[PDB]
């Protein structure tokens, strides 16, 4: 018994001239207010990691690049998808330094805060400081698998 509109508000992460936002999954009637929050935080790029339960037509009509990169639940992202992530942030962070990139799963306690966590470890921040930062922003971030993956992976790519 979980909720859809009962999750807490999206969280903004700022680190080393980078701005992310972890948020949750909307539903057809909601996206007016959701993308309202998107434009509020200044997000130019949204990465959907859960299954498609909303129409990308509105959010792309507002002028937000949306990227359907799903993978199985409870699992770490594949290497293809972390590639795409890192390069994506290189491009969209090269186009406007200070732009917020947003990412969402069912609720922002899954693969989305994992991807922003990898993005945090590659920008120079420690693993413990990263995970404690993210779940200090919204409690209960990741499962055991995602945390072990988060520890056992090494950064090199600016």
């Amino acid at each position: 018994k979980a909720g859809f509109m009962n999750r807490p508000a999206p969280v903004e992460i700022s680190y080393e001239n980078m701005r992310f936002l972890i948020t949750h999954n909307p539903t057809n009637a909601t996206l007016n207010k959701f993308t309202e929050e998107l434009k509020k935080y200044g997000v130019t790029t949204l990465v959907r990691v859960c299954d498609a339960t909303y129409d990308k037509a509105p959010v792309e009509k507002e002028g937000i690049h949306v990227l359907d990169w799903p993978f199985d639940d409870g699992a770490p992202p594949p290497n293809q998808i972390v590639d795409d992530w890192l390069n994506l942030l290189k491009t969209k962070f090269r186009e406007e330094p200070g732009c917020c990139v947003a990412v969402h799963d069912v609720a922002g306690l899954g693969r989305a805060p994992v991807l922003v966590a990898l993005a945090l470890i590659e920008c120079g921040m420690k693993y413990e400081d990263a995970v404690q930062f993210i779940r200090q922003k919204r409690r209960g971030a990741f499962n055991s698998k995602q945390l072990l993956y988060l520890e056992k992976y090494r950064p090199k790519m600016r």
Binding site: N6, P8, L109, G140, K145
Partner: protein, 149 residues
């Protein structure tokens, strides 16, 4: 007497919302698809509650909350669905994690916030991604009676 309630207010600092909540199954809730007829309106009357949650397709997915004043000039002659009234007024939902101390969410209640609080707990108990599970509702009266009893 006054002593027992002193130990009450002092025990607020330990007991969590999860000790005082009422599970979703037992809460009086309204489907967003219900229509305010004589029957349901009468149920809201004799419910003993002034703030009633309105869910959508599942008791867990609590969309909005209906205050008793929202029914001011509603007539069942027009079969009016309560979702219309839900988009008439906008009462904000108040959420609270299960392990919140009672003194705290008490001060939250007194700090203007609605006397009703939806209780959530994180659920890692599964190989999928963590999510917030809706346990139930906690109200001002629950805490007050936690001190006066």
């Amino acid at each position: 007497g006054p002593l027992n309630m002193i130990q009450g207010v002092l025990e607020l600092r330990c007991r969590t919302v999860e000790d005082v909540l009422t599970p979703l199954e037992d809460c009086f809730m309204l489907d967003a698809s219900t229509v305010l007829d004589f029957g349901v309106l009468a149920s809201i009357m004799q419910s003993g509650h002034t703030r009633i949650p309105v869910y959508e397709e599942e008791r867990s997915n609590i969309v909005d909350m209906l205050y008793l004043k929202d029914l001011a000039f509603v007539d069942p002659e027009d079969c009016t669905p309560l979702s219309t009234i839900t988009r008439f007024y906008n009462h904000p939902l108040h959420f609270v994690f299960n392990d919140t101390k009672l003194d705290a969410v008490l001060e939250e209640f007194k700090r203007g916030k609605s006397h009703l609080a939806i209780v959530q707990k994180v659920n890692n108990e599964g190989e999928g991604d963590p999510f917030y599970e809706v346990l139930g509702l906690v109200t001002l009266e629950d805490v007050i009676e936690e001190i006066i009893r």
